[PDB]
Amino acid sequence: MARGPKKHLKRVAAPKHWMLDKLTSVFAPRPSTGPHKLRECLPLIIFLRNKLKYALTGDEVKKICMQRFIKIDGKVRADITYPAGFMDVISIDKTGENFRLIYDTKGRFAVHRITPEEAKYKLCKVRKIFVGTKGIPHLVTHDARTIRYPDPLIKMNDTIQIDLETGKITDFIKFDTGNLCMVTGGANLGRIGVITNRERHPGSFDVVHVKDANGNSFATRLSNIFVIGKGNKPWISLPRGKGIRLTIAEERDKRLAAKQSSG
Amino acid sequence: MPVARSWVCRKTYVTPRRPFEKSRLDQELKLIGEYGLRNKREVWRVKFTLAKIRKAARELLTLDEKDPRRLFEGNALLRRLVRIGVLDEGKMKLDYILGLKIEDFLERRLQTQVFKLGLAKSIHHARVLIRQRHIRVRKQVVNIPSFIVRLDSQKHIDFSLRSPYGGGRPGRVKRKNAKKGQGGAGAG
Amino acid sequence: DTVTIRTRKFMTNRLLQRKQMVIDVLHPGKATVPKTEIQEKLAKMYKTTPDVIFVFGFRTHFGGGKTTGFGMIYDSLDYAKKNEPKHRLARHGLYEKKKTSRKQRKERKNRMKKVRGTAKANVGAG
RNA sequence: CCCGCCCCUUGCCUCUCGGCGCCGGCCCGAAGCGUUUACUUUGAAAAAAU
RNA sequence: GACGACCCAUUCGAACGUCUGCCCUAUCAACUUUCGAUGGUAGUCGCCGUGCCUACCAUGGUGACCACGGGUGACGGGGAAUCAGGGUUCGAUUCCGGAGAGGGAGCCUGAGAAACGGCUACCACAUCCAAGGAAGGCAGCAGGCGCGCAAAUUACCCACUCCCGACCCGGGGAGGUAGUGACGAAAAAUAACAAUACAGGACUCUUUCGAGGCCCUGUAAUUGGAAUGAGUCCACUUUAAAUCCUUUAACGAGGAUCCAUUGGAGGGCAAGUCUGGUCGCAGCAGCCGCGGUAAUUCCAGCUCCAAUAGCGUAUAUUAAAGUU
RNA sequence: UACCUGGUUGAUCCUGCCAGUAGCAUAUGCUUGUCUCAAAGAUUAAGCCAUGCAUGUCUAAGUACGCACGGCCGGUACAGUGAAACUGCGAAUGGCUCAUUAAAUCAGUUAUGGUUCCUUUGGUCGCUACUUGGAUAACUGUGGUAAUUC
Ligand SMILES: [Mg+2]
Ligand SMILES: [Mg+2]
Ligand SMILES: [Mg+2]
Ligand SMILES: [Mg+2]
Ligand SMILES: [Mg+2]
Ligand SMILES: [Mg+2]
Ligand SMILES: [Mg+2]
Ligand SMILES: [Mg+2]
Ligand SMILES: [Mg+2]
Ligand SMILES: [Mg+2]
Ligand SMILES: [Mg+2]
Ligand SMILES: [Mg+2]
Ligand SMILES: [Mg+2]
Ligand SMILES: [Mg+2]
Ligand SMILES: [Mg+2]
Ligand SMILES: [Mg+2]
Ligand SMILES: [Mg+2]
Ligand SMILES: [Mg+2]
Ligand SMILES: [Mg+2]
Ligand SMILES: [Mg+2]
Ligand SMILES: [Mg+2]
Ligand SMILES: [Mg+2]
Ligand SMILES: [Mg+2]
Ligand SMILES: [Mg+2]
Ligand SMILES: [Mg+2]
Ligand SMILES: [Mg+2]
Ligand SMILES: [Mg+2]
Ligand SMILES: [Mg+2]
Ligand SMILES: [Mg+2]
Ligand SMILES: [Mg+2]
Ligand SMILES: [Mg+2]
Ligand SMILES: [Mg+2]
Ligand SMILES: [Mg+2]
Ligand SMILES: [Mg+2]
Ligand SMILES: [Mg+2]
Ligand SMILES: [Mg+2]
Ligand SMILES: [Mg+2]
Ligand SMILES: [Mg+2]
Ligand SMILES: [Mg+2]
Ligand SMILES: [Mg+2]
Ligand SMILES: [Mg+2]
Ligand SMILES: [Mg+2]
Ligand SMILES: [Mg+2]
Ligand SMILES: [Mg+2]
Ligand SMILES: [Mg+2]
Ligand SMILES: [Mg+2]
Ligand SMILES: [Mg+2]
Ligand SMILES: [Mg+2]
Ligand SMILES: [Mg+2]
Ligand SMILES: [Mg+2]
Ligand SMILES: [Mg+2]
Ligand SMILES: [Mg+2]
Ligand SMILES: [Mg+2]
Ligand SMILES: [Mg+2]
Ligand SMILES: [Mg+2]
Ligand SMILES: [Mg+2]
Ligand SMILES: [Mg+2]
Ligand SMILES: [Mg+2]
Ligand SMILES: [Mg+2]
Ligand SMILES: [Mg+2]
Ligand SMILES: [Mg+2]
Ligand SMILES: [Mg+2]
Ligand SMILES: [Mg+2]
Ligand SMILES: [Mg+2]
Secondary structure, eight states: OOSSOOOOEETTTSOSTTOOOSSSOSEEOOOOSSSSOTTTOEEHHHHHHTTSOOOSSHHHHHHHHTTTOEEETTEEOOOTTOEEOSSOOEEETTTTEEBOOEEETTTEEEOOBOOTTTTTEEEEEEEEOOBOGGGOBOOEETTSOBOSSOOTTOOTTOEEEEETTTEEEEEEEOOOTTOEEEEESSSSEEEEOBOOOOOOOTTSOOEEOOBOTTSOBOOEEGGGEEEEESSSOBSSOOOTTTTOOOOHHHHHHHHHHHTOSOO | OOOSOOOOOOOOOOOOSSSSOHHHHHHHHHHHHHHTOSSSHHHHHHHHHHHHHHHHHHHHHTSOTTOHHHHHHHHHHHHHHHTTTSSOTTTOSHHHHTTOOGGGTTTTBHHHHHHHTTSSSSHHHHHHHHHTTOEESSSOBOOOTTOBOOGGGGGGOEEOSSSSSSSSOOOTTHHHHHTTTTSSSSOO | OOOOEEEEEEEEETTTTEEEEEEEEOOTTSOOOOHHHHHHHHHHHHTSOTTSEEEEEEEEOTTSSOEEEEEEEESSSHHHHHHSOHHHHHHTTSOOOOOOOHHHHHHHHHHHTTOOSOOTHHHHTO
16 A cells, blocks of 8 residues: 555665665665755765765764754754755864765765855755735745845846855846856756757747857756856856766776876 | 565576587587586586677677777777787787687686696696695685686786695695604604 | 784764774784784774774685774773664673563563553563 | 859848947848658657666 | 744645557447436536536437457566567566455544554354353464465564654664575586506617607506595684684595486487397387397396486477468 | 478478477476575465564653652752653554456656645744633542453
8 A cells, every 4th residue: 555655765766876785775764855855865864874984874873963063054953864955065063074065977966075164155046936925025946945035136047145044145146148057957967068048948848058168068958957157157166077077988098097096 | 575685697608509419529528628627517608708708799890980889898898808818919909809719718717827837737736726725816815716817917826825835834644644753653 | 923903994083982994904824813802902003992992894805814894993981882882882891681582572562551550560570 | 072153042021129340320140930741860858676 | 942833835745637558359340328428508516627416408429540348377567588680478576556455335533544453334254151242354474274286484683774753762573684495596526646567659779570768548556645625623703692604723535435416328319230138018219110039229237428416307488480 | 609300202302290409487306515695375265364473652841749769858830760641643654465457557748827735944923911711541449240452
């Protein structure tokens, strides 16, 4: 039977970009309900023992999190399967280090340490616009936040830079032809380039083009574009190799020349 | 029940279709004698690992040149072959792979190198020594006669550092008899 | 002597008040080293004590010689008493184990599920 | 075998609102789509394990 | 700070709906309808769209491009076996979707159930009794009967992966561990090496004979000494606690055991026109065929063949089959 | 590895099939030293089931007069550990099997502008009062039936 919501998640059926093994055991953490979709999230448990190696078994994650050390967007989260996701800024005070969840160019999250004078603001993508009771205009971002009284020029698909202690958006980039963008869905995942186009098929999945810093172009769907810069100048810091998605015939050459077989 | 296991496994040989055919039985018996193997199956393994290389080679050679896939996988297959001493870097192209014979994979076996590099009296003596843990590759004992020696591992094969044949306590026979001089020939 | 320790991929974990690393033991000719005999040499290596040190794993290769295992070194003793799994504190006695089977616990619970107000004799008289 | 020339060459139109030029006046990109399909080629989008 | 709470969004879903996609059957050719069948108008009901259901009205909808009826040892798919190229057959079975807890039916509580480790009633079974009454659902894990050609222990533990809870602490036959296991897959032992004696060849010498001889094979008698695990077994290691494997001290090989088997020997098809026995009997033989007193085919000894820690037989299926 | 071989005739050439041949998966026979993996009451009967077990849960933070244990003597909101019991939550996930079921289920594709949503995350929280009412469980005590988580 299914008569209600499920609550376990099998290890094989889990998302691929979690990069889980196969022979530990039958289950996977099953992210809890949150602001980020179940396939797009990264639970806090998978970030501390599969990536940062800080813990070793699930109980060590539970007793790291209980001591109130970890902060997800300023607030102090105690749930180990909390669904962190794209544009969230984990902070570990007791160590003095910070991170930004951004897709690496193979289409998966990777650790990306940032300077503590940067981990005070995060970007959000506008999803909806509506006028509440008494005539107040609202906003909905990709991570479920609701901003009341936003500027009357910010529209859908735009990006806004908020603060983590107030909300209260500060800057906003407008979606049009010429601005930077990072792609967050499908085949082209974690690539960067100027938008350069947008076609519009009314009633079905408008399509968007892009263009890398090496001529490479790659279409996508508009609901997968995420503007991160005014133009050619990304606001937030970037991972190494900057979304350039080199082919395997190049990846082999760099592996051979660097001879990165040790340290 | 769901369970935390790999069921993935596979076969590594194929029997021949004509079961009693003289041209076959005499050739394989020759190959067993000349390299000191145990069954016919020890030959059908090598036949399989060659006939499977010769399918990738062919399917690449039926792609068009300049292809991404053909280029990448060919440069990867020739590298893998050259790295075990089955191919000559002076060939390094696909239309030569189709010219390889079974007796080049058999030649790179550890049993063969232990004889041909001089450490044993015969191709049969070599198989005994390897199986008795008398030989070492690079700071590592090995015990499998069929181990295939990579090209630059070649000059590392030598007698084990805990073994009678070179720096080691005499075995349980040379010690039982030297004791027969002090326990069987002195007061016994 | 032949025995020797060499550490690997060291990491100082402040989130759990320990430093953890991997241990290599180059011990040719001999049997595997006892865990006690390892942890005192780690002490002399890190200059603390053979009491805030825990080691486990330790599989030996084919052929003899090396073995590799995991090791952790705590700051206080009590942080180890908090942050360790119980059975690893039992190995070198610092904890003890109680009720003698899973069956007895199970069947007591099922007898107690059939009385109200005070479960009484089912525990107090066994 | 990307341009325009024998009559045609993305086939035109006519505009209008907004950027690209020159010294207001005039020049060219976008909006309409070209009678419809099948075919072929390229993109998008498609769970993991096998 | 904990808790609760209206509504909005978000999350995990759920529900209904669009296009295309199915095995065999004509010895199924017309089917559907006031017992709603296709449509319209207004309502009832429901979380919402809707003949979903009621009242009035119209007479429609489907079919040789296979409707409707029947059969399926039919739960669908990701996939599996074989496979030049095309294909054929399988998919109860660990991932995803569906459906069901003896058969049918009705409902409480809840955000969520037409729930059976919940309740009520009928049908079929079955238990206790003081004959008034009460109680039940292993297609969860073990275990037992039955059925059959056909399938393991009434063990251990929450340490690992995760889930539930008021929760850093409790619980989990989910899950892990060990037992039985020739379903099946990978690696791989049961002899290596010298001397001596015979045997044989390239080479040297001798007109040859013959001799010297280096390279190999057997084969004998002994030996000759060396090598090593299968085992017995102290410790460490392993792990929740143990077992196994790996690491190590001590014992442990002369071959008459520390013993390799299963099927064949006319042909197809690798291997005997040996010897003893039986006499168209007993038997063999997938097919052709053997046996009637002189059996290369039966029964046995000897020898030889093929695969080998495996081989034979029955059956379903694929290639051979360009015999769909 | 894109393959054939025996058999109708006195002999020959054909059609044509039966037999051989190789893999696979269920059963069964003979045999068995080592070591790493690991399928296993599906087929018949979705037949029937003795016994045990498989679902419970407390924090600084709902309700503590069990003396049950308890300390420096006091509850003067009242200490502190805390059985039980009311209250809340979960029990609708997980596990097992394949009887039903052929435009059904299911797959890819799309839509809710035609709906509901415990929980999590973010919004929202101003048209006798220094604090109201009666009534239950655990606990004390008396019971009934052969019998039950009465
Ligand atoms: Mg279920
Ligand atoms: Mg049900
Ligand atoms: Mg969770
Ligand atoms: Mg109507
Ligand atoms: Mg209506
Ligand atoms: Mg009609
Ligand atoms: Mg009609
Ligand atoms: Mg029909
Ligand atoms: Mg089927
Ligand atoms: Mg069926
Ligand atoms: Mg194929
Ligand atoms: Mg299936
Ligand atoms: Mg069945
Ligand atoms: Mg089953
Ligand atoms: Mg299922
Ligand atoms: Mg679905
Ligand atoms: Mg039954
Ligand atoms: Mg509820
Ligand atoms: Mg029911
Ligand atoms: Mg149930
Ligand atoms: Mg009941
Ligand atoms: Mg009843
Ligand atoms: Mg049951
Ligand atoms: Mg059972
Ligand atoms: Mg029987
Ligand atoms: Mg069986
Ligand atoms: Mg049986
Ligand atoms: Mg657990
Ligand atoms: Mg616990
Ligand atoms: Mg189990
Ligand atoms: Mg096997
Ligand atoms: Mg033996
Ligand atoms: Mg052993
Ligand atoms: Mg122990
Ligand atoms: Mg025999
Ligand atoms: Mg016979
Ligand atoms: Mg005979
Ligand atoms: Mg024959
Ligand atoms: Mg023959
Ligand atoms: Mg006679
Ligand atoms: Mg005779
Ligand atoms: Mg005779
Ligand atoms: Mg066939
Ligand atoms: Mg005839
Ligand atoms: Mg004839
Ligand atoms: Mg046949
Ligand atoms: Mg066979
Ligand atoms: Mg095992
Ligand atoms: Mg199987
Ligand atoms: Mg059954
Ligand atoms: Mg019972
Ligand atoms: Mg308390
Ligand atoms: Mg209290
Ligand atoms: Mg309760
Ligand atoms: Mg509930
Ligand atoms: Mg079962
Ligand atoms: Mg049904
Ligand atoms: Mg039908
Ligand atoms: Mg039918
Ligand atoms: Mg349909
Ligand atoms: Mg679907
Ligand atoms: Mg559908
Ligand atoms: Mg809850
Ligand atoms: Mg809220």
